[PDB]
């Protein structure tokens, strides 16, 4: 097949670095910069050779042309009220970016409020993050450019939707929060940097500051509430408590799943918001999560995960704070993880949890914590929901595999509560019933079972002989649950495959312990678990190693490139998205630092033994027996992903070229795609989605030799 030539990539071979005494190379480390020739001339190389592979082969084309036809859908996101007025974002199908819409009320005629396709031609420019105030009259919303992580906060007057001449600055990783007295707003953001911050810079993200920003002024004015000079990765996000009355305080530091909480009582300042405020160091450790529910008065409710790995609503008194006089709300469920809850209509909250990996959802009574109803859901998601404490209605919105989904309206003042559906859209082309999701549970290597999604077409022979796709996260308490994908459908009707998503430790399917059972000494059993779900699609007759292909981005990206050296014989195709591939320099930029809390630090001696077994960069090599050769392989990365840098993949690619590439055994292609005005993936637009995945599946289709199915 291999019709191309890998590009020439010199190697440094003086570039070596001690860690306790082991000795690592890193002959492709000049990669690290990407402003110099020598890295955009790699980049330009490795297109080059990838993109005619790519599109080759008319399967991408089909693959395009169905893509378009199928994904072109309405998609709606469910209604919230923020003061008089209704909103809800819409997207006719194909555009770039969705729109925001509002309507005076729920009868109402809908008008475009915020449309970003009109901020940039390729719909590079997109909505990250937004903050109405209290009255809901004034909005501040985060635009980010090319897909950096960057933000820049505009304002807009509501009625009229009227722009504002404010503008903040230098924002990222930020909250934003009104106070009630709609005076301004609290925000995030970095001091000035040397260099560049547009998102194709690597410098490290550190001494992140909360500042206060009183509309009508220049950001020059903005007061200084928080910061934290001795402790530079520390993180401090502000909201308001619904009474108006208190700022809180939430202080993180990396990605372990527990925060500082410290308060502010407004009432309390000599003379309104003028510098740091008078914080009240409630719980000053990170020890648990606390997130904020509601109060009324003193007696705040949270979540927290304090002794608690599954998560409970706890009630602590300001006036009593101590722990041992804390209430405990509603308890932790011995398996179920809550996995959030929303206070509505003063007195009622909505708890969701996850069953299995599956969403449910009740309301409970505030003052008690006891079960009032149960709101009736298919086996799936919950992925929207809408309902602050002053509102009297609910909006929800659940999705699954095989259909795009459901919003759900719930008036909250009728005596007896009747959900309904509020909107309903089917996508023309595909049948749900033609398929079935099974949910099945795998042993691991160490016994552990583990949770496994399948999606086939019914009535399937399992003889070995289908093509799979098996995806996989893995990491950070995330609970990879029921999505609807229409690219991935693609691959089950037209090119006869079988999709699986493997729950795998390190995520948050089973609480606390199943993150903690996926990171740090413990990283290798999600690969494990992963190779194991492997190994069952195979034995169990869905598919065969040279039919399976594997997929997961950014720590998802980690895990099958780890998979691919670890198990080269168990794969036919990888496909890598924006994966953390230098497990020894990660914790360098930008904001790598963060995620410490599930890796660890090749500072560190003891990190440094766990790290170097599975680093993908660091454990490239060849298979010993002659009949085995790696995968077919491809890397997607992009040169604004600012969450993880691009020389992850661009070191790693250089790696796999030279060790295996070279090989006379290996047939398989080994290759990148490197995007332009693109970063790690939110806020992308449709187009780029479409050419993403129409990439992705024709890649399959030619390593596998897949033919289409019209």
């Known amino acids: ?61 089909l693959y395009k042309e169905r893509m378009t036809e199928l994904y072109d859908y309405p998609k709606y996101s469910c209604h919230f009220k923020k003061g008089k007025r209704y909103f809800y974002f819409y997207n006719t199908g194909l555009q770039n970016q969705r729109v925001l819409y509002v309507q005076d009320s729920l009868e109402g005629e809908a008008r475009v409020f915020l449309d970003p396709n009109i901020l940039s031609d390729d719909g590079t420019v997109a909505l990250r993050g937004y903050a109405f105030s209290e009255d809901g009259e004034y909005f501040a919303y985060g635009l980010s450019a090319s897909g950096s992580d960057w933000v820049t906060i505009k304002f807009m007057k509501v009625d009229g939707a009227k722009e504002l ?11 934003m929060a009104w106070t009630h007295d709609g005076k301004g707003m609290f925000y995030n953001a970095y001091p000035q940097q040397d260099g560049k911050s547009d998102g194709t810079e690597t410098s490290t993200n550190l001494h992140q500051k909360l500042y206060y920003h009183v509309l009508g002024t220049d950001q020059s004015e903005d007061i200084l509430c928080a910061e934290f000079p ?70 705040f409710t949270f979540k927290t995960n304090r002794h608690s790995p599954n998560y409970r609503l706890i009630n602590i008194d300001f006036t009593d704070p101590e722990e041992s006089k804390w209430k405990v709300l509603v308890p932790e469920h011995e398996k179920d993880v809550l996995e959030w809850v929303a206070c509505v209509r003063s007195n009622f909250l909505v ?73 309903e859209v089917t996508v023309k082309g595909i049948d749900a019933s033609d398929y079935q999701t099974v949910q099945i549970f795998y042993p691991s290597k160490d016994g552990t079972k583990i949770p496994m999604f399948i999606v086939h077409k019914k009535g399937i022979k399992l003889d070995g002989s289908h093509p799979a796709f098996l995806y996989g996260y893995g990491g950070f308490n995330i609970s990879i649950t029921p999505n609807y994908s229409v690219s991935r459908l ?117 990190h440094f033994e766990w790290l170097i077994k599975y680093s993908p960069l660091h454990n490239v090599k060849l298979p ?52 332009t005005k693109a970063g790690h993936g939110a806020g992308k637009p449709t187009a780029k989605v479409i050419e993403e995945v129409s990439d992705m599946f024709a890649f399959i289709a030619r390593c596998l030799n897949i033919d289409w199915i019209p």
């Not at 490795?46 to 599109?55: A, D, M, S, Y």
């Not at 008036?411 to 509560?417: A, H, I, S």
């Open 165 to 175: 001449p404010d503008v903040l600055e230098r924002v990222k990783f930020s909250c």
């Open 351 to 423: 708890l969701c949890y996850l069953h299995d990996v599956k969403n449910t959802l009740q309301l409970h009574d505030l003052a008690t914590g006891a079960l009032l109803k149960i709101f009736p859901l298919e086996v799936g998601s919950v992925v929207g929901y809408s309902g602050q404490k002053k509102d009297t209605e609910i909006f929800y919105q659940f999705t699954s595999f095989l259909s795009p989904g459901i919003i759900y309206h719930c008036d909250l003042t009728k005596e007896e509560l009747e959900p309904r559906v509020f909107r």
């Open 1 to 61: 097949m291999l019709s191309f030539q890998y590009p020439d990539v010199y190697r440094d071979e003086t570039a070596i670095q001690d860690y306790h005494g082991h000795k690592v190379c890193d002959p492709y480390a000049w990669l690290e910069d990407p402003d110099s020739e020598q890295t955009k001339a790699f980049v330009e190389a490795q297109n080059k050779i990838t993109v005619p592979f790519l599109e080759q082969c008319p399967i991408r084309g």
């Open 624 to 675: 010993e027996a002659d009949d085995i050769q790696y995968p077919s392989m491809l890397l997607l990365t992009a040169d604004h992903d600012d969450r993880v840098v691009p020389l992850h993949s661009l070191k790693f690619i250089a790696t796999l070229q030279y060790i295996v590439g070279r090989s006379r055994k290996q047939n398989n292609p080994l290759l990148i795609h490197v995007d």
């Open 490 to 606: 693609i691959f089950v009707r037209h090119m006869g495959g079988v999709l699986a998503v493997a729950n795998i430790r390190g995520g948050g399917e089973y609480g606390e312990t199943w993150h903690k059972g996926g990171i740090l000494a413990n990283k290798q059993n999600c690969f494990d678990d992963f190779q194991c779900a492997a190994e069952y699609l195979i034995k169990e007759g869905y598919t065969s190693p040279k039919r399976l292909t594997i997929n997961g981005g950014s720590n998802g990206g980690l895990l099958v490139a780890t998979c691919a050296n670890q198990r080269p014989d168990l794969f036919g195709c990888v496909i890598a998205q924006v994966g953390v591939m230098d497990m020894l320099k990660f914790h360098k930029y930008t904001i790598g630092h963060a995620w410490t809390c599930d890796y660890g630090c090749s500072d560190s001696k003891q």
């Open 230 to 299: 001795d402790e530079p990765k520390w993180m401090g996000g502000a909201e308001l408590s619904d009474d108006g009355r208190y700022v809180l305080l939430s202080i993180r530091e990396g990605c372990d799943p527990v925060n500082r909480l410290w308060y502010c009582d407004l009432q309390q300042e000599s003379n309104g918001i003028t510098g740091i405020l008078k914080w009240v160091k409630l719980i000053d450790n990170f020890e648990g999560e606390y997130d904020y529910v509601t109060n009324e008065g003193t007696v």
